[PDB]
Design a protein around this ligand. Sequence first.
Ligand SMILES: CN(C)c1ncnc2nc[nH]c12
Ligand SMILES: [Ca+2]
Length: 430
Amino acid sequence: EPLHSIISSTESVQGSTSKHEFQAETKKLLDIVAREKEVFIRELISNASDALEKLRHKLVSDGQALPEMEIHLQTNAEKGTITIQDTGIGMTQEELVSNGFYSAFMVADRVEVYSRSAAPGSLGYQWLSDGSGVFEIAEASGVRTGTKIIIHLKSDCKEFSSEARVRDVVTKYSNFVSFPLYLNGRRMNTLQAIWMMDPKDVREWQHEEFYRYVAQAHDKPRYTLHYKTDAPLNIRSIFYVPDMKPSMFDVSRELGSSVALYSRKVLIQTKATDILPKWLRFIRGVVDSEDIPLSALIRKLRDVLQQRLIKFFIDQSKKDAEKYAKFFEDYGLFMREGIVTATEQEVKEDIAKLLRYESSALPSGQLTSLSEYASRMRIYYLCAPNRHLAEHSPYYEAKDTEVLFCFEQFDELTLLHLREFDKKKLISVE
Ligand SMILES: CN(C)c1ncnc2nc[nH]c12
Ligand SMILES: [Ca+2]
């Protein structure tokens, strides 16, 4: 039996507990906090992961051996309890007094905590609170290094004492936790949050495996962007462009982005809706940012990613012009839609930087960007069925001025919405 559990009633308190008042703010908080509810598992697992990370980081800095670093969850139906224990850095009495965590009171009639700091010669402490105006602290024996939280669920939340209900919660939210997580002695997590890895270390087989998981697809990604940054915000993200052509569902999908939102390897909202501009909904991948509450002021992240993705495609066109040509053929509609739907001029020009057209100066079949046309001028366009019809259209013959050639009616409406590029106005020949 490969059952591995570490949770047991080893703690004991010798003397009585001292009673403490909750700060003015905290007391108000515990009431608002206790008004869905299942997210507390997410919060507690994330807290345990942080605790384990601090200890592991400290032990490596001191070149000391690493102990068992695990997160364990236990459910007890007879006692109506849910317990989470980690073998992390723990807490001292000072940190325990000051003491995310209070999300436990969403479902708890009373909370019971045992913690022992990893520092040598530390003591175990017991922390008790019913979510009222008083909590209790006392020295405890038999407290394992790390932290143990025992939640006595109120009758309205007894479901969280069932292994089936908790297992569904853990799998949905905490699938990518970086430390081994156990539920009633059974290992749960096996997926790797590859977006946290060093971009140059991720192997092609990992990107393909992850793309198929996030996109629920069976093809491969033709483009992969591993974007990590901390200057504006904290961003750990990977974006994939499917190898397939866009599907009728992709072009007509409403209120979806096909991008997962994460915070510290913990899920925030699967199929995040407003993480990317709607015209980038054909993108698959994940966005991880610790600067997320847990739904108004996210736009700053959306604009940063739009610019980064637009830069990525501009670079892709320069690295391989032929691969980008078919990408434009397959996904150009999204870019024209993004311009038609844009409201500010600077975004329209940025997206338009991705658009490709044919030119009278270049041979049939060769593409050119609006910037390359602007570079060579000493912006005029003509929309016609095809190239030969364009050269023979009366509008074109009428000074060694080069003219861009569009073929679709959306191209014209796109250029019509994009009045100007780089302060050069767009004027149709005919
Ligand atoms: C809740 N909180 C602030 C914590 N501090 C340190 N180690 C912990 N292990 C689980 N929760 C912990
Ligand atoms: Ca994976």
